[PDB]
Design brief:
SARS-CoV-2; 2 chains; 98 residues; mainly beta; two-stranded antiparallel sheet; Spike protein S2' (chain B); binds 2-acetamido-2-deoxy-beta-D-glucopyranose; Spike glycoprotein; 5 strands; part of a larger assembly; elongated; omicron spike; viral protein
Chain lengths: 98, 99
């Protein structure tokens, strides 16, 4: 009988699965993966000041806003791809199709 | 109560008080997803919502059209009395309107 007890990702992890890392790209809205934190957005260098015992950030909605690169130890930001809404202006099909 | 040509906006010296005393959320609409950058985001309260899916639409009459309307009302009333509201405007001296 062996018991395994562990705690999930809240601090810098040390044991991971066998997965290979790719290059780091910034200023293009991509879908990323940091130690199992999956998402989508734009990455840019930040001005935040993380203390050594720490690597993540949060907003009032409790969603990640910054992250410490697990290979270079630099602070990045997260921001969704730009989006919006669309409206169509028409004079009426009885009059025209423009 | 009459408009002041000297200021860039043509408000009155009382409408200026009324505008400096009421603190709005974000005057104007300049965000347009071209402002919320780096640490400038997650600190302002406008970006924190625009990133969630909640947006604000601008009104149809700008703040400079409503001032024109009120100036028209004042000019009409002080130059013609109650006649301009029930037909064509007819002029009359003011100290003969108070009578
Ligand atoms: C623990 C650790 O970070 N090991 C290496 C580091 O020594 C190296 O500088 C970097 C660049 O490839 O890759 C990683």
């Amino acid at each position: 009988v062996v018991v395994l007890s562990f705690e999930l990702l809240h601090a810098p992890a040390t044991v991971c699965g066998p997965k290979k890392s790719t290059n780091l790209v910034k200023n293009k809205c991509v879908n990323f993966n940091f130690n199992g934190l999956k998402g989508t957005g734009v990455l840019t260098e930040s001005n935040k000041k993380f203390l050594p015992f720490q690597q993540f950030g949060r907003d009032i909605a409790d969603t990640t806003d910054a992250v410490r690169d697990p290979q270079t130890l630099e602070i990045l930001d997260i921001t969704p791809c730009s989006f919006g809404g669309v409206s169509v202006i028409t004079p009426g099909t009885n009059t025209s199709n423009q | 109560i009459l408009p002041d040509p000297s200021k860039p906006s043509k408000r009155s010296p009382i409408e200026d008080l009324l505008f400096n005393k009421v603190t709005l959320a974000d005057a104007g609409f300049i965000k347009q997803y071209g402002d919320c950058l780096g640490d400038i985001a997650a600190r302002d309260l406008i970006c924190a919502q625009k990133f969630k899916g909640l947006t604000v639409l601008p009104p149809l009459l700008t703040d400079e059209m409503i001032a024109q309307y009120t100036s028209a009302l004042l000019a009409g009333t002080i130059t013609s009395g109650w006649t301009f509201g029930a037909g064509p405007a007819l002029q009359i001296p003011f100290p003969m309107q108070m009578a």
